[PDB]
Write a protein that holds these residues in place. Structure first.
Motif, mmCIF file in Angstrom:
data_model
loop_
_atom_site.group_PDB
_atom_site.id
_atom_site.type_symbol
_atom_site.label_atom_id
_atom_site.label_comp_id
_atom_site.label_asym_id
_atom_site.label_seq_id
_atom_site.Cartn_x
_atom_site.Cartn_y
_atom_site.Cartn_z
ATOM 1 N N UNK A 87 0.791 -1.184 0.000
ATOM 2 C CA UNK A 87 0.000 0.000 0.000
ATOM 3 C C UNK A 87 0.837 1.252 0.000
ATOM 4 N N UNK A 88 2.118 1.121 0.354
ATOM 5 C CA UNK A 88 2.976 2.303 0.631
ATOM 6 C C UNK A 88 4.391 2.152 0.037
ATOM 7 N N UNK A 89 4.417 1.739 -1.196
ATOM 8 C CA UNK A 89 5.639 1.451 -1.875
ATOM 9 C C UNK A 89 6.714 2.546 -1.796
ATOM 10 N N UNK A 90 6.366 3.794 -2.102
ATOM 11 C CA UNK A 90 7.302 4.874 -2.154
ATOM 12 C C UNK A 90 7.095 5.926 -1.070
ATOM 13 N N UNK A 99 0.733 10.048 -3.935
ATOM 14 C CA UNK A 99 0.660 8.666 -3.428
ATOM 15 C C UNK A 99 -0.611 8.312 -2.667
ATOM 16 N N UNK A 100 -1.375 9.314 -2.232
ATOM 17 C CA UNK A 100 -2.674 9.002 -1.615
ATOM 18 C C UNK A 100 -3.593 8.342 -2.617
ATOM 19 N N UNK A 111 12.453 -4.468 3.339
ATOM 20 C CA UNK A 111 13.038 -4.521 1.967
ATOM 21 C C UNK A 111 12.078 -3.962 0.983
ATOM 22 N N UNK A 112 10.787 -4.267 1.135
ATOM 23 C CA UNK A 112 9.827 -3.804 0.144
ATOM 24 C C UNK A 112 9.797 -2.284 0.104
ATOM 25 N N UNK A 166 0.187 5.061 8.607
ATOM 26 C CA UNK A 166 1.629 5.267 8.374
ATOM 27 C C UNK A 166 2.039 6.723 8.146
ATOM 28 N N UNK A 167 1.196 7.494 7.502
ATOM 29 C CA UNK A 167 1.491 8.914 7.288
ATOM 30 C C UNK A 167 1.620 9.643 8.615
#
Ligand SMILES: [Ca+2]
Ligand SMILES: [Ca+2]
Ligand SMILES: [Ca+2]
Length: 387
Positions: A221-224, A299-300, A260-261, A309-310
């Motif tokens: 959900x939060x790659x970058x 990214x939202x 890692x992801x 996470x934000x």
């Protein structure tokens, strides 16, 4: 910051907490369950501080605070269930108001249903969210969104919600008058009586945030999010707090794949369906600038960046961790997790509807718990002895 202190923070943010392949995640998991269990099985009752405001003391009910629920009309019964528990375990003795927000218009039946289950003198306010403070902004390329969300399988409104709860809720006109919110979601449980004014506890002991559960996120959900966040921090190193919760962000030892992801983030976050928050922090420059930067990244919408996470990244990076309080005493459940503290043997503070220390009934989810990392690395000398 002194260049050396800053450099040392940057180094920590660019490397894993534990060197790759020096640890077995299964052993880490067990150790962590054990650390968690030691805290959860400890008999506690309330914060061991001086200044607690009791029900009917002059300061009771005087913080500028509200209980806040973001709801759709169809949530009426579920939010009522949560409200009744909140009142029963806490707010019937303190009388803080409720603020309800909705991206649609509230119906009169919603409002009356809410009013019918609260005392007559309980203050409630209902507010609509302006479309421009909810809807996918123009800056987002919708077909790019549609493409990314096709792969990712989603409801647009879930994306809007995440964004809203990250960066917009605290600007709502109804909240302008409040310093504190207790965020409440539908269908939760509270198990234990709280006999002090929570907001006043926050204010008097300089806590800007309170949580009960602390989890790993879904990395896809939060790659970058983390990488973008790293670049933001490198452009605004003065926003970093020297006692940020940096290790919590960087703990790769229990779920190294999540680390890692994301290329550097544990994915640990405060589980924001419950939160006590000092809005001064969210209204402060570091938090507002961070939100504007994530708004610009998109990214939202292009990814699935959750408010949790934000919020957690911003709290970990831009504040002293010792100002973030783990409300061990607030017995709380939202499927599938529970914070259930232990009472002294003669105590009826908790209602007995949770099993002390049982985080979840599904042991496969045990590795979603990040609380041990928080205990081990983020709790200040004060927090560690506070219960
Ligand atoms: Ca260096
Ligand atoms: Ca860098
Ligand atoms: Ca960089």
């Amino acid at each position: 910051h002194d260049a050396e202190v800053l450099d040392s923070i940057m180094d920590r943010l660019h490397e894993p907490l534990y060197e790759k392949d020096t640890f077995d995640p299964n052993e880490v998991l067990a150790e962590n369950k054990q650390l968690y269990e030691e805290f959860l099985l400890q008999e506690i009752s309330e914060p061991k501080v001086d200044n607690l405001v009791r029900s009917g003391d002059p300061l009771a009910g005087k913080a500028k605070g509200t209980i806040l629920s973001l709801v759709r009309n169809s949530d009426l019964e579920d939010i009522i269930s949560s409200i009744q528990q909140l009142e029963e375990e806490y707010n019937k003795n303190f009388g803080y108001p409720y603020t309800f927000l909705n991206d649609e218009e509230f119906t009169d039946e919603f409002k009356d249903g809410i009013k019918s289950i609260l005392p007559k003198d309980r203050v409630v306010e209902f507010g609509t969210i302006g479309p421009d403070n909810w809807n996918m902004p123009d800056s987002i390329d919708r077909e790019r969104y549609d493409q990314e969300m096709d792969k990712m399988s989603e409801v647009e409104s879930y994306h809007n919600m995440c964004r809203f709860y990250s960066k917009e809720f605290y600007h709502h006109p109804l909240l302008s008058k409040y310093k504190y919110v207790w965020r409440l979601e539908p269908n939760v449980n509270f198990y234990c009586k709280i006999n002090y004014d929570v907001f006043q506890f926050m204010n008097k002991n300089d806590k800007i945030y309170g949580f009960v559960l602390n989890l790993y996120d879904s990395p896809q959900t939060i790659e970058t999010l983390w990488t973008s966040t790293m670049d933001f921090v490198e452009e605004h190193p003065n926003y970093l707090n020297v006692n940020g919760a940096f290790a919590w962000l960087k703990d790769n030892s229990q779920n190294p794949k999540n680390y890692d992801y994301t290329q550097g983030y544990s994915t640990c976050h405060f589980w924001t369906n419950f939160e006590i928050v000092d809005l001064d922090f969210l209204r402060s420059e570091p938090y507002e600038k961070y939100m504007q930067y994530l708004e610009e990244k998109g990214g939202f919408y292009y990814e699935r960046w959750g408010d949790a996470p934000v919020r957690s990244l911003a709290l970990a990076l831009f504040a002293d961790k010792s100002s973030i309080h783990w409300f061990r005493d607030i017995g709380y459940h939202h499927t599938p997790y529970t914070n259930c503290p232990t009472c002294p043997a003669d105590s009826d503070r908790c209602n007995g509807n949770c099993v002390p220390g049982k985080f979840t009934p599904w042991s496969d989810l045990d590795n979603q718990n990040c609380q041990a990392t928080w205990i081990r690395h983020s709790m200040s000398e004060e927090e560690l002895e506070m219960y």
